[PDB]
Swiss-Prot record:
GO terms for cellular component: cytoplasm; nucleus. Brassinolide binds at K54, Y81, Y83, N100. May be a general steroid carrier protein. The lineage of its organism: Eukaryota, Viridiplantae, Streptophyta, Embryophyta, Tracheophyta. It comes from Betula pendula. SMART domains: Bet_v_1. This is Major pollen allergen Bet v 1-L.
Amino acid sequence: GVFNYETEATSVIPAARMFKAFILDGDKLVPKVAPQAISSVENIEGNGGPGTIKKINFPEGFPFKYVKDRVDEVDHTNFKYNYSVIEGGPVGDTLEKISNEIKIVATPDGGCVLKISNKYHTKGNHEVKAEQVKASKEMGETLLRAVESYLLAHSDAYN
Ligand SMILES: C[C@H](CCC(=O)O)[C@H]1CC[C@H]2[C@@H]3CC[C@@H]4C[C@H](O)CC[C@]4(C)[C@H]3C[C@H](O)[C@]12C
Ligand SMILES: C[C@H](CCC(=O)O)[C@H]1CC[C@H]2[C@@H]3CC[C@@H]4C[C@H](O)CC[C@]4(C)[C@H]3C[C@H](O)[C@]12C
């Protein structure tokens, strides 16, 4: 079946800029600013639209060596990004796939809020504990704060 988890994260950076830096060009920026969490991102095939497959490689010592993301949908206008984890780690073992949605919304103070939705499609009767998924939240937060710090220090980037 499916386990649905949702979380939110806030940022002081405006939505359009965060969307462009973190999501659209995250395969280039994240490995640069957060090498301790993502060693590299490889484009397997596609040019960025639906069907694009990317391989996310993790640093030595991490539990899983890599996962592959497949881009499902991209709304450059309302800042919505849908992608699926289709291979690697537990996927293919206890999970069939993970479907995620990221929506970035502007706040009146000039910042933004990232609304994250994760749907874990399990295999058989495996249970995904809400406590075990906290690891994806912390990873998410780490990457976000690293990109935010970079964007505050380089005003000319991703304008
Ligand atoms: C695979 C996990 C979590 C999956 C889940 O548990 O729901 C997610 C959590 C944060 C994700 C990263 C966010 C920043 C980047 C977004 C890019 O567009 C694709 C590469 C990066 C580096 C993403 C790679 C991968 O998609 C991660 C590391
Ligand atoms: C905890 C769940 C579910 C595990 C299960 O049901 O067996 C799994 C599913 C996908 C897993 C993530 C895959 C991407 C990353 C791999 C890294 O090497 C460790 C951190 C991350 C972010 C993993 C954290 C955690 O291991 C998750 C979120």
